[PDB]
Design a protein around this ligand. Structure first.
Ligand SMILES: N=C(N)c1cc(-c2ccccc2)c(CNC(=O)c2cccc3c2OCC3)s1
Ligand SMILES: N=C(N)c1cc(-c2ccccc2)c(CNC(=O)c2cccc3c2OCC3)s1
Ligand SMILES: [Cl-]
Ligand SMILES: [Cl-]
Lengths: 7, 230, 230, 7
């Protein structure tokens, strides 16, 4: 699963 | 507001306690109360706000995806749809609350680049979460609202912040995810991630060891997405 | 009750969905609604009830322990105590809700050993959680209420269930934890864990491969506690 | 940390 900033 | 009788400083102290206790709904309620006191938020306070709602909405989004998948499989009684709708409605309510805090009145009072970019990124993020579940007459407008917030944040960050700034990097990361999976623009997503990564790389030499660690941590997320997408 | 208008079967279906989504507060609300329909619960339904409230109260207990430790350190403003009290009150409310379901009217309608022992173990468990945070005039009575529920469950389980029965084993495990850390009876705790483990061992030969796996899983928890305690 | 049944 792709990363976004909060993760 | 149920937090109207508590001191601002006590709300911030209890938000930090709730984080340590992994009580993120409490943390968000405390930070909502702190915002509603009407003063601007410090850097640390902005991060507490962001962490609290990220964890709340993150649990809801993860649940929604589980339920949506089950619902899809079942379309290849009304209970699955009903329960997915319940979670979806609760999620939308959280996004609406966050967007309401940003509009009343965090963004308009934010003059510094670090605060204004932080809040505009958050506005893009929470419209993006609305877009993840949107299907009706207003989905295109939801998508454009996310794009518009991200774009203004990008314009400011490019003028006012160095390319290694962690807020700038996290903004670009999330705008690239927006392009990839919301706007159906995977090439734009890849181009933004690559340009962001390369310009940060070339600025690392200006940083302290601590700042270097901060920036390269987020650069690694950009790289990992590029590896997944190419 | 807010679940009074939903069908029993839909509440059970949605509890299973909420488990898959890791939405345990929802799961508990759905199972509370199912109990309040007034019919007895099946084995599977009893497990759904147990899992839901175990996860809800487990988050609260973990938060309480974090906050209590912070509070203790700070005694070596009122905010830490206040917030620990808030979590404690919410936890007590959950325990009171569960105990109310058992008293109105799950236990009195439970005639079979598997159901009666299950519910009496749960009654002991939730009085034990009340005892973990108790400090005032009623703490000794809370402790004795847990002991009394566990004891009746033990008496029935010894008469009516084989020593490898997973409900019997989990009951003995939790009664042994009660002895160790609530009743300040570590020798009783160790003796119960050892006798339970040894009598289960000697009964494993009667079991199918699946039952053997079920029983030995819980035996391993008994063994691990003995290793920690000796 | 000691085990109870639910964990
Ligand atoms: N309570 C919390 N969770 C936090 C409190 C503070 C804080 C801020 C200012 C002063 C004191 C504390 C935080 C600061 N930022 C991060 O951790 C962070 C996250 C992503 C990327 C980067 C980060 O740092 C710069 C690079 S996070
Ligand atoms: N939804 C859930 N979480 C469950 C549904 C059912 C279920 C029951 C009957 C019929 C169908 C399903 C469960 C049954 N028990 C366990 O898993 C379990 C836990 C601890 C020890 C043992 C266990 O099994 C026997 C040994 S758990
Ligand atoms: Cl529902
Ligand atoms: Cl509080």
């Amino acid at each position: 699963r792709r990363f976004s900033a909060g993760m | 507001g149920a937090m109207g009788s508590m001191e601002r400083a006590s709300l911030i102290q209890k938000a930090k306690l709730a984080e340590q206790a992994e009580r993120y709904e409490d943390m968000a309620a405390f930070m909502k109360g702190a915002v509603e006191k009407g003063e601007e938020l410090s850097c640390e306070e902005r991060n507490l706000l962001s962490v609290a709602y990220k964890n709340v909405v993150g649990g809801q989004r993860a649940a929604w995806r589980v339920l949506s998948s089950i619902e899809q499989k079942s379309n290849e009684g009304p209970e699955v749809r009903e329960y997915r709708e319940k979670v979806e409605t609760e999620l939308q309510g959280v996004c609406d609350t966050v967007l309401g805090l940003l509009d009343s009145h965090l963004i308009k009072e934010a003059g510094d680049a670090e605060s204004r970019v932080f809040y505009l990124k958050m506005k893009g993020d929470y419209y993006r979460y609305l877009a993840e579940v949107a299907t009706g007459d207003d989905k295109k407008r939801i998508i454009d609202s996310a794009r518009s917030a991200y774009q203004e944040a990008m314009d400011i960050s490019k003028k006012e912040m160095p390319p290694t700034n962690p807020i700038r990097l996290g903004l670009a990361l999330n705008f690239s995810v927006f392009h990839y999976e919301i706007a159906n623009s995977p090439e734009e997503a890849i181009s933004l991630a690559k340009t962001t990564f390369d310009e940060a790389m070339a600025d690392l030499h200006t940083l302290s060891e601590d700042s270097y660690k901060d920036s390269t941590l987020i650069m690694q997320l950009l790289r990992d997405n590029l590896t997944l997408w190419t």
